[PDB]
Symmetry: C2
Subunit: 266 residues, 2 copies
């Protein structure tokens, strides 16, 4: 007597059995998990290879995320449609999953925008150590750090476990995957981690790594790395290809100590 | 506001108003031609509404989604994508693109966005049944040199066609009761930006591939299609017939020979004769 929603997510380009690193797939999967956890929806998630013939013919060129509600004969291929259906369901069963917060919206966009500029600038430059970067590349790195600081500041003013309060919202479903992508790509491709002095931001990342919605929907490190390399036309050798999948959900020991001192975790 | 209007010296530079660039999926036959992506046409129509009244500057550019530069520049995002360079902003997600256009429409008192669950259901139900019929008939005709006529189809294929006609009929009925130029009233809204391209796709694909026209007795609907073919927002953003056909062929994996690949592009915006008369004799145009 509760709706079944099937979510199609883009598969890893390395192994089509593994979930890929599309951020919009993780956003909706997180939302759906939040409804699933509390018995408001039935949810199946399926991986798909977007280059496949059956995929193209079945969705006429739509890309994941795609959500299906067969009991209603409804296919939601557009992100507006998927969000609207999940919002309707959240609202129906009084689940506080959606809120409007222009501050979060701006912080999220601006962080990832600067991340993308830095990723491209540094990869092209390296075709190095961040400390040694010349001004014209280093400025992109600094701007990423500035946005990370801004979110640290926001979390520090709010004193909240999640971005808007003590419960998860659509904005965590967007920011947490972006932060984790920033970490994984930072450490592997760019030469940096999130600055250790941003204790609130790190506490929020710990919160992500303790949130079942995030954990269950999180791609392996190798699949995050391949996602960006593939779109950037960066070669991935077979050693890399064959790496057994891992999920790096660790916090630096000194950061964990700082989190305890300031009381930023349970 | 007039009192206030007398107290504002708002500048007269075309470069005052926001510049929004829309990247649209190109034709897979000739990448210089606009493709048939329905979300691209929806937002282009909305941008044109704002463009034509001087609310925004708008440029449109076609892209081969398979190009290395496009993949690298937008990290896998697909058209439609909207750029507002002067704000350093890139809207890659349809929620973001709509959000920005919605904001601007509101800010300048433009009645472009409304909420209507009648309209939203009718649009979805029409295109859903069209897609079912497209897929069912294409598969039925596999291994035949001459395609089947719709009138000869067995019940489990023909039902999708009948459901298409039912939904077209439902929309005709809604328009007849509303007596409006556009779907919701006198002004183009986002729902027109969704239905008019869908209707035109259905008309072109019906005549060219599936063996049917939008029924000629649906006079109010045909009047609304005529409205489309007289709305600059629609006309300017409308792909050529060959690119609409190719769009569905390339995903339905159907064969495009050298000839229709070399077919010179045309845009068929023609109402049937008796239908145009019916429209005139009811004053629907
Ligand atoms: Ca989608
Ligand atoms: Ca898009």
């Amino acid at each position: 007597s509760k709706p079944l929603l099937e979510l199609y997510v883009k598969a890893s380009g390395i192994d089509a059995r593994r979930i890929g690193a599309d951020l919009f797939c993780q956003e909706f999967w997180m939302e759906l998990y939040a409804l699933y956890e509390i018995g408001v929806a039935r949810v199946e998630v399926k991986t798909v290879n977007v280059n496949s013939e059956a995929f193209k013919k079945n969705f006429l060129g739509a890309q994941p995320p795609i959500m299906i509600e067969e009991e209603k004969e409804l296919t939601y291929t557009d992100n507006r449609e998927i969000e609207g259906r999940i919002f309707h369901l959240a609202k129906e069963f009084n689940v506080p999953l959606f809120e409007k917060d222009p501050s979060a919206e701006k912080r999220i966009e601006n962080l990832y925008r600067n991340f993308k500029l830095f990723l491209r600038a540094k990869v092209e430059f390296d075709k190095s150590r961040v400390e040694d970067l010349p001004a014209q590349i280093k400025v992109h790195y600094n701007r990423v750090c500035e946005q990370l600081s801004n979110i640290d500041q926001l979390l520090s003013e709010r004193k909240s476990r999640y971005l808007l309060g003590n419960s998860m919202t659509e904005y965590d479903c967007e920011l947490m995957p972006r932060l984790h992508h920033i970490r994984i790509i930072g450490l592997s491709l760019l030469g940096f981690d999130i600055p250790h002095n941003f204790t609130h931001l790190w506490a929020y990342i710990l919160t992500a790594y303790r949130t079942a919605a995030f954990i269950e929907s999180c791609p392996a490190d190798q699949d995050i790395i391949h996602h960006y390399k593939e779109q950037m036309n960066l070669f991935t050798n077979q050693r890399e290809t064959l790496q057994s999948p891992t999920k790096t959900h660790t916090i630096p020991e000194k950061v964990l100590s700082d989190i305890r001192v300031k009381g930023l975790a349970p």
